[PDB]
């Protein structure tokens, strides 16, 4: 074959680049970061009408002040989430304080490149880590299996991402309210999803300094889809 | 903790186990069941050092319950007693040995006969018509040697036990706050809900 | 073929092509020499100046091992450093058990066995350096040269890198035209000249000269660097001989 | 054909890496010879110092393994020194454990067993050397035992190794077919050395100066190598024919 | 590095088969046929040897039929050497159970552990699987008489009658034809031989190319005897059934 | 070709292709500049955003109060090597009560990188570093290259189009080397040098990163509103 | 038998004000009836506006102060130069001390 | 990073062949002819001592090896592989039998151990099979005299008489003609010397032929007296002279 | 220990060893699970390339993990035993430390975790097995049916099928299972399960196996006897 930790003549790691292809095949995930909170949204993409859609868990809690959306080989994220939760709870035990969102992300990203002849291959999943801390306020991070993480005002990952990202480039301004961001995530999901967006094949969540990280119930999201469809009829 | 008794009658095994749990100066509890059900027709009573007793009992229980699931079959009381002996005989040369004595009362459904096994913390096993651990034996073995008969009914066995518990309550310095009694027969395990 | 893709594989000739490929990386390197003198040894090396952004005097290439042994090498510099680090562990361990500082022949075989060991397995790469080393022990002066194969011998003089052939020929002259012996201070000047003569082949960039020496009379049997005045004397002697 | 790269069998039941290790044996282009006296074992090897920059004293393929055992190597020097250091370590360890000096043939067997392992285990390459062990063993008398990359070893009346090995062998074969004995029937080691050098000159058809030869001698309780002068003395005596 | 020379013995084909398991099964298909037949009152093990030479020591020998404990025996098809490794493992595993529970090991539990070992060699370790298929003939006091087979895959299944090794397709058809549930041991013995007679790859099926064993109820009632037939007894049972 | 399969294999010309490929990841990396007088040592690093919605990848890491580096290439490798350096600085401090020489930091980094290039199943580091530090022998600048080659310089630049800045510094050598006692003038020279390596886009407030260490200056990082003064 | 512990005496005192705090200690270091030093400070600035003293066995005291000062340094490195809260420092020191639960630091620590 | 070869170098081919065992058997085929014969009151194993050089002292290279006082081994194929197998066979006879039961293992049990070692080289990571076939001749109190063959696979079979290596096909035919179940040991030695002449090209005398018997107990070879139940080794190597004595009546 | 990375990424971003593990499942004998309103039923095809089987002693295709949870599978039979054993140990371990039997979701999540671990561990191939895990959480009467696959992803299903010709019977259940109207009775759920197998299963002979799990550890398997009575009944309902 050839080494698992070998460089291409371009100077990139083959196995890292190939994992990035797996993430492009994954269901869409969008994050928007506002001064009123950070919103996480995902395409659920049930592979058949018989599978119970609310058993699809692609948005996940890490601590009360940190949430996580995933896209790619979602089974690979089990151990990433486990490490993140352990890191967050452990830091609280050692320092009697909430652990910074950047520090949490950096800890998760340290796993990523610990592979080769430690795990056998890189992770086949990208994470949108969203949280609040006192020092740097509301934050969205993109954690790749390359070990690199970027901070974003808004970011899309998965199959819809190329179009969704150019769409976020347009509509994001520094004065977005939370309600606007919720609608804006629904809008861009509906726009890139194959099947038609309802409250069963898509899911919302936010993190506020006040109420922490909450996954929205299907009833709450359904009324935001109504609000979206009504809004776009106007003008 | 303190007193644990067993007697095999015609077609059942009766285990009586003291209810007291004493932490130095104070009796912390007066309703402690010093027993685990290992399988539907096998019961183990235990007495010895604090923590070790329950840790060992629950460890054996889990192992026997795992065997039951794997084979969809209940191990004979002989087989369970042989397993438990080996675990103790293992532990006696450990860095920190299990400090636990046990009675295993089981009804062998394959042979339709009740069996009582007495195993001490060294891994010393014997099949007995009647057995006890620690100081219990010194008071009760004289009564059982006299009154016991291999063909006694369950109620006869309970009466002979009532006599044993009375002698202990008369001559034991320690107040063991009475016994919980349990019967193991062809229909399984039930608790005589007062004495 | 396929015989040259894996280290420690014998070709049908009976050669280890990966060791021979290692030698190419050595030949590709800057020129380095050792001159064995009356009561000591002299080491000199060619340092190419990529840019006047190189701080002069400040990118030292000659390495001391213990207190009485000099090492210089041509080819992959990191590989050389890794070999010296091992040489230092070997010399410290020898001193620890036997109290006496490691004799040069004994020290040569410690590097010899280590370098040879990296030709025994497909899971390691051979050393990309030829190493010229030596110093003063209780039996007088010793100069040695070691190659990626693990092959080493004692030398009157030795050279490796790009300018190895000019140096080799210039060393051969001295051995003939000074048969009874060359003095420590003589060998320092001669070393400077031969590096300047062998700079013919790395003509492209201009260079910085670096000399060290280990002499029983001149340095008390310790390895010291030729700095300041005696350096400038040997640089001047060399400038005169390329005219 | 990856059965050519590691020590696994070829379809015709061959280990090519072992065969190619034997070819590396002759890479130095040196010929060695060993004979037995009554009292001694003599080993002679060609000494070739092509480079004038080399210190000729440091150029040797003869090794003092123990007080009593000497070893000459046909093959590249790095593998030679690897083998020498190992045999030195093995002969010292033997003495410590068993309370007597390691015999020539036992060290030969031990080094041969080590060689055998490299032919069976894949991650170890065989060493490209043939090891000729000589002593005056306290039980067996003068002894020659030789080891190859295959892990083969045997005792010899006399032996030769190198490119011109076959010529030196038949030359010695003929002397023994004639003389009709196991050994060189000679009193002094000096005259067994003279015999060895003589029959090397005849078989190779070339003449030797004092710096063209390397000589080792095994006697009761010491094996030693001759200096340039000890050889020069010995060459001068050979002139009287 | 060393990756170059690695066959990868534990990977899937694009069809989702285990290359090395399939090739090991191919290996076993060239091995001397072994037959197991389970009667109402016992089990028969019969095995044909790879074409014997007349100088091969006939009597003091057992290359095909091995004893695991007093109540369990196996017939081997494949590499004898690979089989003996697994057999010694099984013999120990049986003795471990007896020491732990003071009861003879149930036949299936022994069969499962041996099958679980084989399975391991197909999923991890990068070693070749064992080129061996077993027919397990045993008795326990839960299921009475039991016939099992295990193959290099680590798969095992229960049987009324089964063959392993060469010409099993031919043999399985002949057994499927003449086998019935009420059948007694002496009938099963006769069926076993008749089957090898028809599926053997040489003309004469003589005593010297046969290993034979029975696990019978026959003893002092309630206890089980295990009989590995001496060559004279195989010659007798071959003359009795009129094959010689 | 066939000799780029792993780091344990030499080419017939005698090159390590896996190392050369690692070297390649640096030139794809965003430009970073190093330069120093006798009193101060400055890092200027051009930071690269993923897109318009993303943050600007931080390129400068602090190692001790007297030492720190800028990175070009794989940031995770910069994190591992900077973290290793922090430990060595910390070890020198705790055991010997001694600020670690910048020259010794270079040797330790070289020897760590080398180990990954000589044994099977490893991989070269895919990052280049510029190490500045004020130690017991004045101001120092180092260029680390994942071949293991570490070089002490007056100034340099590494990454994409870094050749521009590297020739400017090669010209301005005698100007900047004698900016002693002035922090701002030594930084300005660095911001002018990095400008030679730009095209189309040029230095905004949140794309530019400056670090300075010196005689009476702990190694400190300037970002955002605190670099507006230099644009 | 080797006794790994000693007693270097000394006394320390911490008082909390409304918008200030004092941590005081004598500067005397003793063993048995001898004075080792008349000025050997045992109250240290640890940065992030935290002062610390580990009084008792000076070797264990210096070891702990040194480890906590290092803990501060790495908190800055790992959490983007964040200021270590006095409560967060307090919890960190608990883990430092309890880390050696079965071979204690023979010191009474005040921050 | 030394030994990365933790995977089998012997794998099944699509045809179901194990390549490296077949190739090892090929290597044995090339080997010098060796044979063994069971008499009623003993066993004989014999082989040719093919010399590399006439200068070689072929008494030093011993192809027939004592494993226990009552068990001997001879081989065809690769001599070095045989040498290390004899060393491991001698040691395993002690470590896993004599040090437990205080007596030497019976022939089939020691054969079983040698077979096991050879099977592991057939499956263990980073090794080739042994390139030898052994003939192991021995006696034990409860089995009497026996002769076994062990192949690179680890397979072993008992023989009345057999041969391996170069001229095995030829020699096996010769032995079939001459073998009966009523051979006295002396008769089997004579037959072994006849069978071996066929395959031997060059000189055929006591110095080119290696021959050992598992026969009667040899008190003279024991080295001590005083224990009446230790009667000494049944294994005996025939001297150069003792072989030539029988080449008269040939 | 053997270190080699067997499950690695391909240029198209696929892990072939995982995808090939699914091919082994595709080949596996068909298995189906159907949620009742207060029961779950596990149906299993058993191939008839062989009779002369002994079915008292042959491994049954539905395994009890605990007294309240069962696991069926499609794919490599030997591989399934290793997952079943680990799950049974984890079930007893959960009881021992939490003092409560596993939830079906937890036991699923564990088995799924084991399967995933073997997709990024050196020297191991993924499990050639997909599983249906069915049962009732302790002191709960709401039924649970989960699926796991070699990749390690798992999810809850109203009804689901795995193994050979599963696309056929998934199409059947998609057409014949109303979520608004789950099979109310036990008999109703058992019928729909057998019907879906009879699209694929050849004969009604010893080709079908049904296991029915009710709440409070009420698990019982039907004998050919009682399945034949569904096979007989559905056959006589084809008269349109």
């Amino acid at each position: 074959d050839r080494g698992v930790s070998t460089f291409s003549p371009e100077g990139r790691l083959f196995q890292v680049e190939y994992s990035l292809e797996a993430i492009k095949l994954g269901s869409t995930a969008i994050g928007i970061a506002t001064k009123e909170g950070v919103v996480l949204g995902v395409e659920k993409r049930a592979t058949s009408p018989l599978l119970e859609s609310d058993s699809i868990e692609k948005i996940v809690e890490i601590d009360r002040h940190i949430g996580c959306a995933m896209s790619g080989l979602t089974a690979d994220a089990r151990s990433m989430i486990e490490h993140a939760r352990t890191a967050a709870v452990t830091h609280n035990l050692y320092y009697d304080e909430d652990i910074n969102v950047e520090s949490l992300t950096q800890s998760v990203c340290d796993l990523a490149l610990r592979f080769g002849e430690l795990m056998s291959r890189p992770f086949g999943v990208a994470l949108l880590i969203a949280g609040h801390d006192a020092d740097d306020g509301y934050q969205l991070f993109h954690a790749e299996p390359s070990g690199t993480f970027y901070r974003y005002n808004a970011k899309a990952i998965g199959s819809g991402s190329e179009g969704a990202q150019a769409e976020l480039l347009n509509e994001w301004h520094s004065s977005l309210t939370l309600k606007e961001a919720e609608l804006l995530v629904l809008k861009i999901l509906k726009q890139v999803m194959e099947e038609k967006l309802d409250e069963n094949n898509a899911q919302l969540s936010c993190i506020t300094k006040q109420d922490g990280f909450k996954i929205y119930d299907n009833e709450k999201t359904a009324e935001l889809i109504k609000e979206l469809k009504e809004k776009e009829a106007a003008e | 903790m303190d007193i644990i008794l067993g007697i095999r009658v015609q077609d059942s095994v009766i285990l009586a186990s003291s209810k007291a749990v004493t932490r130095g100066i104070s009796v912390l509890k007066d309703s402690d069941d010093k027993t685990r059900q290992l399988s539907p027709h096998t019961l183990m009573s235990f007495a010895g050092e604090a923590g070790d007793t329950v840790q060992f009992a629950e460890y054996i229980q889990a192992n026997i319950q795992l065997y039951s699931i794997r084979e969809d079959y209940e191990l004979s009381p002989q087989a369970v007693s042989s397993f438990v002996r080996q675990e103790l005989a293992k532990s006696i040369r450990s860095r920190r040995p299990y400090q636990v004595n046990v009675l295993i009362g089981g009804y062998d459904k394959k042979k339709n006969k009740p069996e009582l096994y007495q195993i001490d913390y060294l891994g010393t096993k014997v099949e007995l018509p009647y057995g006890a651990h620690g100081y219990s034996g010194f008071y009760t073995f004289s009564l059982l040697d006299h009154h016991y008969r291999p063909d006694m009914t369950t109620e006869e066995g309970l009466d002979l036990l009532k006599l044993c518990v009375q002698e202990l309550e008369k001559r034991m310095p320690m107040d063991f706050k009475g016994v919980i009694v349990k019967i193991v027969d062809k229909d399984g395990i039930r608790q005589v809900d007062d004495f | 073929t396929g015989y040259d893709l894996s280290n420690s594989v014998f070709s049908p000739d009976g050669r280890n092509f990966q060791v021979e490929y290692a030698v190419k990386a050595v030949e590709n390197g800057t020129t380095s020499i050792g001159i064995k003198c009356n009561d000591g040894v002299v080491f000199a090396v060619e340092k190419l100046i990529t840019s006047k952004l190189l701080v002069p005097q400040k990118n030292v290439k000659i390495q001391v091992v213990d207190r009485h042994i000099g090492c210089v090498y041509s080819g992959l510099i990191p590989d050389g450093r890794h070999l010296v680090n091992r040489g230092r562990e070997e010399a410290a361990s020898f001193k620890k058990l036997y109290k006496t500082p490691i004799p040069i022949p004994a020290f040569a075989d410690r590097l010899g066995q280590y370098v040879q060991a990296h030709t025994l397995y497909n899971s390691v790469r051979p050393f990309g350096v030829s190493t010229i080393f030596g110093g003063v022990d209780k039996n007088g002066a010793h100069l040695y040269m070691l190659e990626p194969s693990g092959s080493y011998w004692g030398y009157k003089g030795a050279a490796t890198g790009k300018g190895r052939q000019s140096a080799k020929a210039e060393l051969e002259k001295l051995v003939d035209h000074h048969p009874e012996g060359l003095s420590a201070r003589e060998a320092v000047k001669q070393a400077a000249k031969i590096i300047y003569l062998a700079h013919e082949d790395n003509k492209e960039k201009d260079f910085e000269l670096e000399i060290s020496w280990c002499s029983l009379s001149e340095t008390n049997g310790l390895h010291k660097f030729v700095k300041g005045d005696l350096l400038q004397e040997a640089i001047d002697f060399a400038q005169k001989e390329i005219n | 054909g990856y059965d050519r790269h590691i020590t696994i069998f070829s379809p015709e039941g061959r280990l090519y890496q072992v065969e190619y290790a034997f070819k590396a044996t002759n890479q130095t282009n040196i010929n060695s010879l060993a004979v037995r006296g009554k009292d001694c074992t003599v080993v002679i090897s060609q000494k070739k110092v092509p480079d004038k920059l080399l210190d000729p004293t440091t150029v040797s393929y003869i090794f003092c393994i123990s007080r009593t055992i000497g070893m000459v190597v046909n093959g590249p020097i790095p593998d030679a020194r690897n083998a020498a250091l190992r045999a030195k370590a093995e002969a010292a360890e033997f003495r410590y454990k068993y309370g007597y000096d390691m015999p020539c043939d036992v060290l030969a067997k031990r080094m041969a067993n080590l060689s055998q392992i490299y032919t069976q285990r894949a991650y170890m390459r065989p060493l490209g050397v043939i090891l000729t062990f000589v002593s005056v063993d306290e039980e067996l008398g003068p002894s020659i035992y030789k080891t190859d990359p295959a892990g083969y070893y045997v005792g010899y009346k006399a032996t030769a190794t190198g490119p011109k090995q076959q010529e030196i062998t038949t030359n010695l074969e003929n002397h023994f077919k004639k003389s009709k004995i196991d050994h060189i029937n000679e009193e002094s080691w000096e005259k067994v050395v003279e015999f060895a050098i003589t029959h090397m000159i005849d078989a190779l058809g070339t003449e030797f100066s004092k710096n063209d030869l390397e000589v080792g001698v095994a006697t009761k309780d010491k094996f030693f190598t001759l200096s340039a002068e000890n050889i020069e003395e010995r060459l001068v005596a050979i002139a009287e024919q | 590095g060393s990756r170059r020379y690695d066959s990868r013995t534990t990977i899937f084909s694009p069809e989702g088969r285990l290359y090395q398991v399939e090739y090991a099964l191919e290996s076993i298909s060239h091995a001397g046929t072994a037959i197991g037949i389970m009667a109402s009152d016992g089990i028969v093990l019969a095995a044909e040897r790879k074409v014997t030479s007349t100088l091969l020591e006939q009597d003091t020998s057992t290359e095909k039929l091995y004893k695991l404990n007093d109540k369990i025996a196996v017939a081997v098809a494949g590499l004898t050497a690979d089989a003996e490794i697994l057999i010694n493992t099984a013999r120990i595993h049986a003795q471990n159970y007896l020491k732990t529970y003071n009861e003879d090991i149930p036949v299936e539990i022994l069969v499962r552990r041996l099958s679980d070992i084989k399975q391991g060699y197909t999923q991890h370790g990068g070693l070749r699987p064992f080129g061996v298929s077993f027919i397990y003939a045993g008795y326990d006091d839960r299921y009475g008489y039991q016939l099992y087979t295990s193959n290099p895959s680590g798969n095992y299944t229960g049987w009324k009658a089964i063959s392993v090794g060469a010409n099993t397709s031919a043999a399985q058809t002949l057994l499927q034809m003449d086998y019935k549930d009420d059948m007694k041991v002496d009938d099963a013995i006769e069926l076993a031989l008749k089957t090898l007679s028809k599926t053997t790859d040489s003309s004469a099926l003589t005593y010297d190319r046969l290993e034979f064993a029975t696990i019978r109820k026959g003893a002092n009632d309630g206890e089980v005897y295990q009989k590995i037939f001496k060559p004279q007894e195989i010659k007798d049972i071959l003359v009795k059934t009129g094959i010689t | 070709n066939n000799y780029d399969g792993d780091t344990v294999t030499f080419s017939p010309t005698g090159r390590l292709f896996q190392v050369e490929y690692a070297l390649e990841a640096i030139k794809q990396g965003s430009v970073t500049v190093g330069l120093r007088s006798n009193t101060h040592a400055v890092l200027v690093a051009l930071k690269r955003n993923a897109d318009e919605l993303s943050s600007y990848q931080k390129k400068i890491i602090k190692c001790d109060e007297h030492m720190g580096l800028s990175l070009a290439g794989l940031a995770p490798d910069a994190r591992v090597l900077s973290n290793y350096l922090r430990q060595q600085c910390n070890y020198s401090s705790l055991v010997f009560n001694r600020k670690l020489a910048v020259e010794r930091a270079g040797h330790l980094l070289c020897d760590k990188a080398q180990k990954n290039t000589q044994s099977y199943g490893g991989r070269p580091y895919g990052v280049g570093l510029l190490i500045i530090g004020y130690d017991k022998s004045g101001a120092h600048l180092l260029e680390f290259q994942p071949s293991g080659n570490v070089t002490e310089l007056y100034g340099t630049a590494i990454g994409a189009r870094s050749q521009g800045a590297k020739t400017y510094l090669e010209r301005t050598l005698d100007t900047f080397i004698k900016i002693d006692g002035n922090p701002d003038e030594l930084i300005k020279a660095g911001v002018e040098a990095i400008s030679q390596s730009l095209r189309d886009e040029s230095l905004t407030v949140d794309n530019l990163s400056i670090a300075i260490v010196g005689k009476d200056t702990p190694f400190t990082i300037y970002d955002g509103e605190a670099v507006a003064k230099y644009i | 038998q080797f006794n790994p512990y000693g007693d270097n005496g000394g006394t320390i005192l911490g008082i909390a004000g409304e918008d200030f705090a004092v941590l005081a200690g004598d500067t005397r270091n003793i063993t048995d009836y001898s004075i080792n030093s008349r000025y050997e400070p045992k109250v240290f600035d640890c940065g992030d506006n935290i002062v610390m003293s580990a009084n008792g066995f000076a070797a264990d005291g210096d070891a702990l102060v040194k480890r906590f000062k290092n803990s501060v340094k790495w908190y800055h490195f790992d959490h983007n130069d964040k200021k270590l809260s006095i409560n967060s420092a307090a919890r960190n020191i608990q883990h430092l001390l309890y880390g050696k639960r079965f071979f204690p630091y023979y010191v009474h620590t005040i921050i | 990073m030394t030994d990365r070869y933790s995977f089998s170098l012997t794998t099944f081919s699509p045809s179901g062949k194990l390549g490296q065992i077949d190739y090892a058997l090929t290597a044995v085929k090339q080997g010098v002819t060796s044979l063994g014969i069971k008499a009623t009151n003993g066993v004989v194993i014999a082989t040719e001592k093919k010399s590399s050089s006439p200068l070689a002292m072929s008494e030093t290279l011993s192809k027939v090896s004592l494993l226990t006082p009552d068990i001997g081994a001879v081989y065809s194929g690769m001599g070095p592989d045989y040498r290390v197998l004899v060393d491991k066979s001698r040691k395993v006879a002690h470590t896993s039998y004599k040090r437990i039961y205080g007596e030497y293992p019976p022939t089939k049990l020691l054969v079983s151990e040698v077979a096991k070692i050879m099977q592991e080289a057939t499956q263990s990571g980073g090794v080739r099979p042994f390139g030898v076939s052994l003939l192991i001749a021995g006696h034990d109190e409860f089995n009497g005299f026996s002769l076994y063959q062990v192949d690179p696979s680890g397979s072993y079979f008992p023989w009345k008489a057999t041969a391996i290596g170069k001229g095995s096909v030829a020699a096996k035919t010769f032995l079939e003609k001459r073998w009966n179940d009523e051979l006295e040991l002396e008769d089997a030695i004579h037959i072994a010397l006849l069978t071996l002449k066929e395959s031997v090209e060059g000189e055929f005398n006591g110095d080119t032929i290696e021959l050992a018997i598992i026969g009667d107990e040899n008190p003279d070879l024991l080295g001590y007296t005083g224990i009446p139940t230790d009667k000494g080794p049944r294994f005996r190597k025939l001297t150069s002279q003792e072989i030539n004595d029988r080449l008269e009546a040939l | 220990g053997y270190d080699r990375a067997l499950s690695i990424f391909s240029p198209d971003g696929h892990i072939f060893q995982v995808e090939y593990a699914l091919e082994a499942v595709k080949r596996g004998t068909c298995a189906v699970g159907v949620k009742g309103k207060n029961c779950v039923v596990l149906g299993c095809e058993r191939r008839s390339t062989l009779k002369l089987q002994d079915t008292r002693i042959t491994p049954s295709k539905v395994s009890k993990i605990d007294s309240h949870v069962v696991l069926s599978f499609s794919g490599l039979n030997a591989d399934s035993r290793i997952l079943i054993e680990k799950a049974r140990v984890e079930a007893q371990s959960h009881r021992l430390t939490l003092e409560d039997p596993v939830t079906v979701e937890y036991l699923t999540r564990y088995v799924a975790g084991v399967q995933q671990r073997y997709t990024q561990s050196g020297g191991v191939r993924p499990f050639g097995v997909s599983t249906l895990i069915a049962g009732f959480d302790p002191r709960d009467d709401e039924p649970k049916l989960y699926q796991t696959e070699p990749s390690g992803i798992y999810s809850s299903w109203s009804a689901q099928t795995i193994g050979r010709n599963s696309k056929t019977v998934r199409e059947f259940l998609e057409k014949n299972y109303d979520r608004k109207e789950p099979p109310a009775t036990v008999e109703e759920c058992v019928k729909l399960t057998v019907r879906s197998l009879l699209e694929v299963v050849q004969t009604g002979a010893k080709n079908i196996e049904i296991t029915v799990v009710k709440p409070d550890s009420d698990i019982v398997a039907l004998s050919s006897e009682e399945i034949n009575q569904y096979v007989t009944q559905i056959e006589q309902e084809k008269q349109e």
Side-chain angles (χ1 to χ4, degrees), chain B residues 67 76, chain E residues 97 103:
Chain B
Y67 190 105
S76 66
Chain E
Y97 189 97
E103 282 183 349

CSV table of all heavy atoms in Angstrom, one decimal, chain B residues 67 76, chain E residues 97 103:
chain,number,residue,atom,x,y,z
B,67,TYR,N,-23.2,-16.6,33.6
B,67,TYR,CA,-23.2,-18.0,33.2
B,67,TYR,C,-24.6,-18.4,32.7
B,67,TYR,O,-24.8,-19.1,31.7
B,67,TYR,CB,-22.7,-18.9,34.2
B,67,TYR,CG,-22.4,-20.3,33.8
B,67,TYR,CD1,-21.1,-20.8,33.5
B,67,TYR,CD2,-23.4,-21.2,33.5
B,67,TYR,CE1,-20.9,-22.1,33.1
B,67,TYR,CE2,-23.2,-22.5,33.1
B,67,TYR,CZ,-21.9,-23.0,32.9
B,67,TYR,OH,-21.7,-24.2,32.4
B,76,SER,N,-25.7,-26.3,38.8
B,76,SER,CA,-26.0,-27.1,40.0
B,76,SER,C,-25.5,-26.4,41.2
B,76,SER,O,-24.5,-25.6,41.1
B,76,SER,CB,-25.6,-28.5,39.9
B,76,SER,OG,-24.1,-28.5,39.9
E,97,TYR,N,-12.5,-26.2,33.3
E,97,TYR,CA,-14.0,-26.3,33.6
E,97,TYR,C,-14.2,-27.3,34.7
E,97,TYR,O,-14.9,-26.9,35.7
E,97,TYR,CB,-14.8,-26.7,32.4
E,97,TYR,CG,-16.3,-26.5,32.6
E,97,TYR,CD1,-17.0,-25.4,32.2
E,97,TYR,CD2,-17.0,-27.5,33.2
E,97,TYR,CE1,-18.4,-25.3,32.3
E,97,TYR,CE2,-18.4,-27.4,33.3
E,97,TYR,CZ,-19.1,-26.3,32.9
E,97,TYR,OH,-20.4,-26.2,33.1
E,103,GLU,N,-17.5,-30.6,37.5
E,103,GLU,CA,-18.5,-31.2,36.6
E,103,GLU,C,-17.7,-31.3,35.2
E,103,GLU,O,-17.0,-30.4,34.9
E,103,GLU,CB,-19.8,-30.4,36.5
E,103,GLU,CG,-20.7,-30.7,37.7
E,103,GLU,CD,-22.1,-30.0,37.7
E,103,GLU,OE1,-22.3,-29.1,36.8
E,103,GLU,OE2,-22.9,-30.3,38.5
